[PDB]
Amino acid sequence: GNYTDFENTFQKTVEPVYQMHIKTSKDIAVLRSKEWFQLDDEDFDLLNKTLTFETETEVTFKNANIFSSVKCFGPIKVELPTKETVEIGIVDYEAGASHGNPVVDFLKRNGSTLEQKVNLENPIPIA
Amino acid sequence: IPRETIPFLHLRKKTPAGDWKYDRQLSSLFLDGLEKAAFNGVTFKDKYV
Amino acid sequence: PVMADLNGGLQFVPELKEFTAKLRKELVETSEVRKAVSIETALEHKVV
């Protein structure tokens, strides 16, 4: 049909967990630039740590393409020497009339997912 | 090796200024190896020259 | 013969090779971190 019902239109996904290995000092300096990377202890040492970002993104619409409001939020966890995780941060990105979720666009490029599909050289016919 | 006397054979060491001075210690080590060579002699087995 | 030293105290900065090399490091390091932060702030604004 033809709906112009943008008041009652939304998107409330739970994004896939993304991890970053902070190896260098111009990786830590980037994360500190981002308003949306709140740490509990600001002095916390990120070097040679593996951060995982467990993030969900509420999005309301005003139009076909432009978003009325974007919202990304979730715990930031660090892998300890023992391989237990601990919360040491929160994502808290909020926006008005936006064309994108920058938080997920960041983590896609500068991070990775926990699993990675790898294609066979040649597809094998099963049946 | 008497003090205040530089031997006739001696090694040198580079000072922070860039010059090479007599070094008592290095020179001692050299002259002891040179004493043993005079008594026992020196081997060059497995030396390629 | 006259030997004129028109070198303004570089005699006395010790290990000048590795010093000069440390100085170029610190300028590049700073420039690179700053340029990487500048690239991401453009991408994460272009997206918004």
From Swiss-Prot, chain A:
Positions spanned in the full protein: 1414 to 1540 of 2051
Paired cysteines (S-S): none
Function noted in UniProt: Fatty acid synthetase catalyzes the formation of long-chain fatty acids from acetyl-CoA, malonyl-CoA and NADPH. The beta subunit contains domains for: [acyl-carrier-protein] acetyltransferase and malonyltransferase, S-acyl fatty acid synthase thioesterase, enoyl-[acyl-carrier-protein] reductase, and 3-hydroxypalmitoyl-[acyl-carrier-protein] dehydratase.
Note: Present with 91800 molecules/cell in log phase SD medium.
Assembly information from the UniProt record: [Alpha(6)beta(6)] hexamers of two multifunctional subunits (alpha and beta).
Family: Belongs to the fungal fatty acid synthetase subunit beta family.
Membrane spanning stretches: none
Name of the protein: Fatty acid synthase subunit beta
Domain of life per record: Eukaryota
Swiss-Prot record, chain B:
Disulfide bonds: none
PTM note: 4'-phosphopantetheine is transferred from CoA to a specific serine of the Acyl carrier domain by the C-terminal PPT domain. This modification is essential for activity because fatty acids are bound in thioester linkage to the sulfhydryl of the prosthetic group.
Subunit structure as annotated in this protein's UniProt entry: [Alpha(6)beta(6)] hexamers of two multifunctional subunits (alpha and beta).
Functional note: Fatty acid synthetase catalyzes the formation of long-chain fatty acids from acetyl-CoA, malonyl-CoA and NADPH. The alpha subunit contains domains for: acyl carrier protein, 3-oxoacyl-[acyl-carrier-protein] reductase, and 3-oxoacyl-[acyl-carrier-protein] synthase. This subunit coordinates the binding of the six beta subunits to the enzyme complex.
Family: Belongs to the thiolase-like superfamily. Fungal fatty acid synthetase subunit alpha family.
Miscellaneous notes: Present with 17000 molecules/cell in log phase SD medium.
The protein, known as: Fatty acid synthase subunit alpha
Species annotation: Saccharomyces cerevisiae (strain ATCC 204508 / S288c)
Residues of the full protein shown: 630 to 678 of 1887
